[PDB]
């Protein structure tokens, strides 16, 4: 019947998606962040698409996971993008790429080196993948209010953390002064903003680089989450 | 508690994994495929990540989403391989890149061009993405005995069919002879031998590279996915 | 005699350079933009570098030429960065990438596509070439104030105009969405970055993407160099 | 006279070449082979191409040198091509990448790396080079039942072994678990393919990876000889 | 018995290599450049290296032919130098980039495009494949002597002539200002060039850019053969 | 007025250049060189670029600087080609890659390494960076006839010796052989003779590979300018 106007991914529509958006690795997640929301709805469920959307502060936002991965994530910007999303910010997670960051505190990134081929299918990885300037502003404003600690700079996204050259990697990033690693945020950034919109990546560390410990780890890395999904959503209520 | 012993996306341990493994993309699709098994036990469930147990004709087989995407899919090749997989069997679907090919017609690929960037991220796109003899073998000899046509050959794997040179990719393929494309299959070929994996990949064939129609189509569609997972099912059995 | 301490191009030292600084392509563009400061100090001349300072709204500057190009830039910088730079603004010429952008409107590079050598030589050009973003917050606010139009984007800088290819290379980049063309920013902004510096740039459009008309272009252009060299001003006085 | 019809190197034409073809790279193994066969004829002979027709076992055969080198191999395959084949497989020699690896014991190429320009010249490196598996399984089947070891699996194919590097190319590819090292193979394969040929590779150990001894060797390579081409022609005359 | 002290594939060893070499594509060519000359001598014939000692006009020369192709001219190179070789000329076949070239009219590369997999082996393609320039004065200096058109210029080395891309190869090479095509040119002049080699490639123009006919293309060409020939000894014979 | 015929950057035209023409970095050198000339004329002046002509033993030559790097050197080839330039000899600077050559003495490039991104705008760093070999030849001749030490061989041309593995980069080049490094010689060897123009190189020693030790260090060193601009106009008052 009505499988004519959806998406064939996200399975939403022009008149559902709001033109702010924030997307996450993980559907689970998407519940998550509607709990800090009024007015929420189930838009659609498909795949590791889980789309949703919530009002916060008076702003109607959606949200959206992506699963893990820069062609998933693709798939969804292509996606909102013909649903008329102008602003997109990822809320991910990211293993540190230095000793001082610890578990729940947030990387914001700046920019990211393009090194996962998603972003590559687009243009030669000459083009920069970098955040709006715009929303960076606002992020910063925001989170120099509060205490959790938060650095903003230079991430890499990459296709696999799991070569046997992991650790090489990781100390050649480390030495650039490279902060934390994802495998989504340049896509984002690359192939976001040859559609026009605005970008940004907020991302919860959640390895380091070097049972009660688990138990405070968890609860810091939780508390980040939150963090990030709550600067997301007050960066995009003021637009 | 038990977090410690188990793989940190699929969330399984080394006892509960079979050497014999199917992957799909889709979760909602292993729910489909244990209907044809005994014996059915749920594993774990994380993120794109949907874990079962069942046997088939005598032989206890894993079955695994993987979500959409060659990150995802090597996520779980390598923490499969951790859990002592030996025989890893991807069951997907692609999109026709000859016009002979009907929906819910299968595709097998013999090789995969390595157009992902996950392959990539291991070892020069110059190492080559092929199936098992085995595996092939197996493979056709079963699909021999049924009436639902199958072409065996090259497929493409690749990070996105949403550039804007999708058509000109569709056109250049075509010619070289290439039967269909997804975004999987030669990640999983490369990693897979490069961890010492036999490796073989069935896909359904969702779109053609050209109400009442609508309904027909999906059961094509369906019966194409049954075919795949009852063709993958038959060859690990023997194994 | 005091030959030893100086660096060997731009010939000035620790204690003569600021951590503030700007940079142009046009050693004949000091003199101009000293115009606008006081207490100004000739303190080297050397090839293509030219070295002055001078005192704007309380605050020291340092104003370096860097002649034409990626490799001569980065000569500058990690000069300019052993003698203490911090805060690097070029302050540059462009071509527009767009029709509508006019003789003497500014072109603020957020971003820039890395297609010359010089950063090449130091990373792979997956890394991203950006502005900081505390410098464009100060740059977007100056402006704004004021009448000449202005473009926030990417530009692209390269290593040669003059290719049998230039046409395309230009149409190609046009409908990417670039604003205009360089030769030095992605340089600065990478070389730049990876040393720690801030670092921006602001181009002065001098090419339109397509007598009295030429001294009224003139003028234009002019006024826009003068602008962009205020704008610099305004910024690095703040810091 | 009639030097307008025949292809220009291997200089035979559509009407003497059979579909089923081996091709080796010494002309003086192209007699050696044809000592196995029936009715042996001399079709031709030209720099490094000697061409003959036999039959074994009923079927006709054509046996090809091609020199060393993939692109001297090239030139044989496509010219081949034009004369009808439909069935090529190579008999060659191979170094050793694995120690258990012994002198006179065969390597069948199941996939090969293309680190050879020949292939490159056509397509893109990340286009598989393997084995058809119809001639895999028949391969299999005929060395099962035979004493003489043989292994299955990757070889290289490159252009030089002769490099200051080799050392390390071997270590590194040893680790891959490459099995062993040509110049051919991963053209055939290529080139081959992308003509539809039906396309296989077995090689003749004759380097280690590591006066009587020099005799037994001689007589193992030259056993490991005799075994490869019989393997090719038990399998080509099944067809 | 002597197997120990010969090179593997040119079978000749330090004693029996001149100083100065002439290397050639073809065997049979090797018979007719000692028809050239006095005391000749078989050294060696194996697979398509066929190699003879002859004296013009008081020295020695070595003639070898190394079949067609960048790799196995590279073998030769390669085995050539540890014999002792110090200055290598090429003599050999080209196809006219051109068209005012005439069959049987000579190019002389000057400098050659590395678009053969052979000379990448060794270093990368940035590094330059050019002619001894002693040489390159000699054989200008025996040429203008003579009523047979030369052209000094660049050639083009590739892997292979038969892709479905040859047209536009050609006609992109023939705007660059390319004469002519081989396989080995670039080769040669490469890898001689990094093992301290002089070197040089005097080319005979065997295909035209654009029965009676037939016999006198085939005198030119062969007349072609004997000039080049001639201008490789009489140069040679010089140092 | 008179600014619609001349070139935008050299600032002269068609009836000004000479087609023979010396280009070096330096502006202050061209005033160095014209010491040695008769009937100078200061032509234009603008940016590095500093034009001048002269007359040496009859003939008129034109003197050009370029400032540093590869895109202002590349900018001064086109526009001198479309004033009529057919002969240019760059006269310039060089860091030794071998340790016994020392201050002061002169490296002739007979071929360049292409490290820069300048020549690579224009075409696959596979096509050959070489010099002239007419001019060569002449160069040879001059040289041969004074006792001052000088090299005929490759340098590399690069667009940064400040990376931090500008170390590596000396020992990798060191072994190959390589004489100097600048960064200029490549892109003139490369565009110049795809312009068709006829090229060199002569470089003067300025860093050793590796009061009073200082004062005949720069003698030396002025020294060997001075030679060299006198050999590059020997050698074009011949012509």
């Avoid at 998606?17 to 007015?39: A, F, H, K, T, W």
Wanted: net charge negative.
């Amino acid at each position: 019947f009505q499988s004519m106007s959806k998406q064939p991914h996200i399975c939403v529509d022009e008149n559902q998606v709001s033109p702010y958006v924030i997307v996450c690795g993980e559907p689970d997640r998407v519940n998550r962040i509607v709990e800090l929301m009024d007015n929420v709805e189930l838009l659609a469920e498909n795949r590791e698409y889980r789309v949703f959307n919530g009002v916060y502060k008076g702003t109607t936002i959606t949200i959206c996971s992506t699963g893990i991965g820069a062609p998933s994530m693709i798939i969804a910007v292509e996606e909102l993008k013909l649903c008329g999303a102008t602003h997109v910010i990822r809320v991910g997670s990211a293993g540190a790429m230095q000793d001082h960051i610890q578990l729940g505190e947030l990387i914001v990134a700046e920019g990211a080196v393009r090194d996962e081929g998603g972003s590559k299918a687009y243009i030669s990885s000459a083009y920069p993948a970098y955040a709006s300037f715009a929303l960076l502003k606002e992020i910063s404003h925001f989170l120099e209010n509060q205490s959790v600690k938060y650095y903003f700079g230079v991430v890499r996204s990459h296709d696999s953390f799991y070569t046997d050259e992991e650790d090489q990697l990781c100390q050649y990033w480390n030495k650039k002064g490279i902060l934390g690693a994802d495998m989504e945020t340049s896509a984002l950034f690359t192939v976001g903003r040859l559609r026009g919109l605005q970008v940004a990546s907020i991302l919860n560390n959640v390895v380091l680089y070097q049972v009660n410990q688990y138990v405070n780890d968890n609860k810091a890395m939780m508390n980040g989450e939150r963090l990030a999904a709550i600067t997301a959503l007050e960066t995009l209520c003021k637009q």
